[PDB]
Enzyme design. Sequence first.
Site, PDB file in Angstrom:
ATOM      1  N   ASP A 130      -2.704   1.776   2.302  1.00 15.22           N
ATOM      2  CA  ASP A 130      -2.216   0.883   1.940  1.00 15.22           C
ATOM      3  C   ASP A 130      -0.986   1.015   1.027  1.00 15.22           C
ATOM      4  O   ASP A 130      -1.033   2.244   0.389  1.00 15.22           O
ATOM      5  CB  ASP A 130      -3.146  -0.127   1.358  1.00 15.22           C
ATOM      6  CG  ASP A 130      -2.843  -1.282   0.501  1.00 15.22           C
ATOM      7  OD1 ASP A 130      -1.855  -2.013   0.741  1.00 15.22           O
ATOM      8  OD2 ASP A 130      -3.386  -1.539  -0.729  1.00 15.22           O
ATOM      9  N   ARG A 131      -0.093   0.415   0.745  1.00 14.91           N
ATOM     10  CA  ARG A 131       0.982   0.943  -0.249  1.00 14.91           C
ATOM     11  C   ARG A 131       1.015   0.185  -1.451  1.00 14.91           C
ATOM     12  O   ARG A 131       0.544   0.880  -2.447  1.00 14.91           O
ATOM     13  CB  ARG A 131       2.318   0.568   0.624  1.00 14.91           C
ATOM     14  CG  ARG A 131       3.531   1.416  -0.374  1.00 14.91           C
ATOM     15  CD  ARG A 131       4.739   0.730  -0.077  1.00 14.91           C
ATOM     16  NE  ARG A 131       5.350  -0.313  -0.982  1.00 14.91           N
ATOM     17  CZ  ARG A 131       6.294  -0.907  -1.066  1.00 14.91           C
ATOM     18  NH1 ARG A 131       7.204  -0.778  -0.186  1.00 14.91           N
ATOM     19  NH2 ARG A 131       6.621  -2.070  -1.792  1.00 14.91           N
ATOM     20  N   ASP A 132       1.246  -1.064  -1.552  1.00 15.80           N
ATOM     21  CA  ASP A 132       1.327  -1.553  -2.819  1.00 15.80           C
ATOM     22  C   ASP A 132      -0.210  -1.882  -3.543  1.00 15.80           C
ATOM     23  O   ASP A 132      -0.860  -2.480  -2.699  1.00 15.80           O
ATOM     24  CB  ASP A 132       1.826  -3.096  -2.691  1.00 15.80           C
ATOM     25  CG  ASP A 132       3.181  -3.051  -2.339  1.00 15.80           C
ATOM     26  OD1 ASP A 132       4.266  -2.843  -3.410  1.00 15.80           O
ATOM     27  OD2 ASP A 132       3.623  -3.679  -1.132  1.00 15.80           O
ATOM     28  N   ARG A 165      -0.046  -7.515  11.146  1.00 15.79           N
ATOM     29  CA  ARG A 165      -0.443  -8.071   9.859  1.00 15.79           C
ATOM     30  C   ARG A 165      -1.875  -8.152   9.438  1.00 15.79           C
ATOM     31  O   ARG A 165      -2.541  -8.794  10.157  1.00 15.79           O
ATOM     32  CB  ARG A 165      -0.010  -9.749   9.691  1.00 15.79           C
ATOM     33  CG  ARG A 165      -0.377 -10.376   8.082  1.00 15.79           C
ATOM     34  CD  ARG A 165       0.607 -11.385   7.884  1.00 15.79           C
ATOM     35  NE  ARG A 165       0.073 -12.014   6.833  1.00 15.79           N
ATOM     36  CZ  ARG A 165       0.521 -11.829   5.406  1.00 15.79           C
ATOM     37  NH1 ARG A 165       1.178 -10.890   5.083  1.00 15.79           N
ATOM     38  NH2 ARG A 165      -0.303 -12.711   4.492  1.00 15.79           N
TER      39      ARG A 165
HETATM   40  O1  LIG Z   1      -0.236  -3.881   2.277  1.00 15.55           O
HETATM   41  P1  LIG Z   1       0.364  -3.893   1.246  1.00 15.55           P
HETATM   42  O2  LIG Z   1      -0.615  -4.070  -0.096  1.00 15.55           O
HETATM   43  O3  LIG Z   1       0.867  -2.320   1.024  1.00 15.55           O
HETATM   44  O4  LIG Z   1       1.629  -4.768   1.030  1.00 15.55           O
HETATM   45  C1  LIG Z   1       1.265  -6.081   0.512  1.00 15.55           C
HETATM   46  C2  LIG Z   1       1.289  -6.411  -0.762  1.00 15.55           C
HETATM   47  O5  LIG Z   1      -0.034  -6.109  -1.444  1.00 15.55           O
HETATM   48  C3  LIG Z   1       1.750  -7.747  -1.175  1.00 15.55           C
HETATM   49  O6  LIG Z   1       0.785  -8.948  -0.938  1.00 15.55           O
HETATM   50  C4  LIG Z   1       1.580  -9.864  -0.777  1.00 15.55           C
HETATM   51  O7  LIG Z   1       1.002 -11.089  -0.547  1.00 15.55           O
HETATM   52  P2  LIG Z   1       0.524 -11.321   0.920  1.00 15.55           P
HETATM   53  O8  LIG Z   1       1.240 -10.478   1.921  1.00 15.55           O
HETATM   54  O9  LIG Z   1      -0.803 -10.848   0.806  1.00 15.55           O
HETATM   55  O10 LIG Z   1       0.460 -12.756   1.323  1.00 15.55           O
HETATM   56  C5  LIG Z   1       2.056 -10.214  -2.573  1.00 15.55           C
HETATM   57  O11 LIG Z   1       1.087 -10.507  -3.468  1.00 15.55           O
HETATM   58  C6  LIG Z   1       2.805  -9.090  -2.975  1.00 15.55           C
HETATM   59  O12 LIG Z   1       3.047  -9.000  -4.481  1.00 15.55           O
HETATM   60  C7  LIG Z   1       2.156  -7.887  -2.605  1.00 15.55           C
HETATM   61  O13 LIG Z   1       2.298  -6.756  -3.092  1.00 15.55           O
HETATM   62 MG   LIG Z   2      -2.503  -3.775  -1.308  1.00 13.02          MG
HETATM   63 ZN   LIG Z   3       3.241  -8.219  11.754  1.00 13.34          ZN
END
Ligand SMILES: O=P(O)(O)OC[C@H](O)[C@H]1O[C@@H](OP(=O)(O)O)[C@@H](O)[C@@H](O)[C@@H]1O
Ligand SMILES: [Mg+2]
Ligand SMILES: [Zn+2]
EC number: 3.1.3.82
Length: 183
Positions: free
Chosen positions: A8-10, A107
Amino acid sequence: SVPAIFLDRDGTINVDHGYVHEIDNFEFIDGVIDAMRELKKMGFALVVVTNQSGIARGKFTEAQFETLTEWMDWSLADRDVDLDGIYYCPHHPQGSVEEFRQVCDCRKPHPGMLLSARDYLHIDMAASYMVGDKLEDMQAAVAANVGTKVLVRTGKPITPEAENAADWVLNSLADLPQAIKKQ
Ligand SMILES: O=P(O)(O)OC[C@H](O)[C@H]1O[C@@H](OP(=O)(O)O)[C@@H](O)[C@@H](O)[C@@H]1O
Ligand SMILES: [Mg+2]
Ligand SMILES: [Zn+2]
Ligand code: NA
């Protein structure tokens, strides 16, 4: 057939500030680069798998993402961490940006990006690891038959559901090399 660490990144590589898309806002989490370089030395391929719904939200462009990701790739390469794959998902069913407005199977918790990485790099999935900070990461891993599912505490505050679904809970990706090495 090589083992991998899906990443995972973030919240796992970079502090999650919310839709990070600018270099000045990209902050490597302490010790993860060293940990990634070690993981590599232990013979794991390393594969980033990141939701980037921010692109479908209109917060930033697939091309700003591309720009950030290239920078990230180089920063790592220059530190002797050579990523074997970088997979992302720009989509969201409710996207305000048409070309990315859609349901998909990349996703997470859809395992799309993991299977694709599987096929393209010929990965031993049962000998592989998934590291993320959310439930969707554990679920994505589960579907793709990733042997070891690792939650980390460096990103989104962990839910009991995220924890239900994980095999390990580590403070951080920085801890993963150690955890693995003691079997
Ligand atoms: O998959 P990784 O974690 O690397 O990237 C995705 C992120 O975590 C993003 O998720 C997003 O929402 P989601 O997409 O869940 O509705 C947000 O909360 C962003 O600020 C957040 O960094
Ligand atoms: Mg994440
Ligand atoms: Zn996709
Ligand atoms: Na979002």
